[PDB]
Design a protein around this nucleic acid. Sequence first.
DNA 1: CCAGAACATGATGTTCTG
DNA 2: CCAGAACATCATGTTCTG
Lengths: 71, 71
Amino acid sequence: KLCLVCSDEASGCHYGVLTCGSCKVFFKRAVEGQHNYLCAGRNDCIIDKIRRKNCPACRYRKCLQAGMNLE
Amino acid sequence: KLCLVCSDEASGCHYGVLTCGSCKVFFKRAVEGQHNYLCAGRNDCIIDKIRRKNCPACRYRKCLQAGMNLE
DNA sequence: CCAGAACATGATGTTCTG
DNA sequence: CCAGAACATCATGTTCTG
Ligand SMILES: [Zn+2]
Ligand SMILES: [Zn+2]
Ligand SMILES: [Zn+2]
Ligand SMILES: [Zn+2]
């Protein structure tokens, strides 16, 4: 049901974790990109259906803590 | 000469306030649309050149605080 | 059913026009 | 010099393809 990263409706088990489609592609793009992501807060942002756009640094961190992985 | 919103280099006085061009068009874009932004942190995100894209809500808030208006 | 590519959509920032 | 439109670009999200 619910994406474990952003709480939007999950679409299936992606990279070892139940996530939505946007989170699946975000994760792959993050790991495979150079990307210096910087939080504007305190490295603990709320990751929502909506707020997930705000902080890629916190979203990527939440992805890892959730267990996402490229095998 | 510094932008009062993000501390980047100001390009002139825009909508009543010394700002860079980035913040000038952002502000105009924000005041015109139906938007309703959400902060993922604690309504005090760091808005600088690097991080200004992270939180439109906090950025808009700094625009208003600095005194920006359509006149 | 899921990975990865592709195709839209966004928001953003610099250039152009009045 | 400034507002507002237009243009380029990039990050994100959905659909297509393997
Ligand atoms: Zn998600
Ligand atoms: Zn964050
Ligand atoms: Zn600025
Ligand atoms: Zn914020």
